[PDB]
């Protein structure tokens, strides 16, 4: 009956010889080769 409606990029790199101390590592190679040569 009714109806309705309605943050900046940063670049870091590692450089040679920083972390690597050449002397403390090349010591044993020298020791070894010389021991070999001597004893042998």
């Amino acid at each position: 009956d009714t109806s309705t409606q309605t943050g900046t990029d940063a670049i870091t790199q590692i450089e040679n010889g920083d972390l690597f101390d050449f002397d403390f590592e090349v010591e044993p190679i020298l020791e070894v080769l010389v021991g070999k040569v001597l004893e042998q």
């Binding site: 009714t2 109806s3 309705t4 309605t6």
Partner: protein, 84 residues
């Protein structure tokens, strides 16, 4: 300010409906609760039974009972009220 886009209600009853709708909108958030409040009110004041339907976007066709069928828009929503 407010509107009634269709009505079937005796003036004082219509003013009562309006004041009830105001006090409901005041004391309610959910819709079905506001509908229940308003319908309980009118049914208890204007001789049951009633039915109420509250919404925001809905198309309506019904077969009401004379002088018991009101449609009005308040605040956000539109409210339809009609007695069985």
């Amino acid at each position: 300010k407010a509107v009634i886009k269709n009505a079937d209600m005796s003036e004082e009853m219509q003013a009562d409906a309006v004041d009830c709708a105001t006090q409901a909108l005041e004391k309610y958030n959910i819709e079905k609760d506001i509908a229940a409040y308003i319908k309980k009110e009118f049914d208890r004041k204007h001789n049951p039974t009633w039915h109420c339907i509250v919404g925001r976007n809905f198309g309506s066709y019904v077969t009401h009972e004379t002088k018991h069928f009101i449609y009005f828009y308040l605040g956000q929503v539109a409210i339809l009220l009609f007695k069985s």
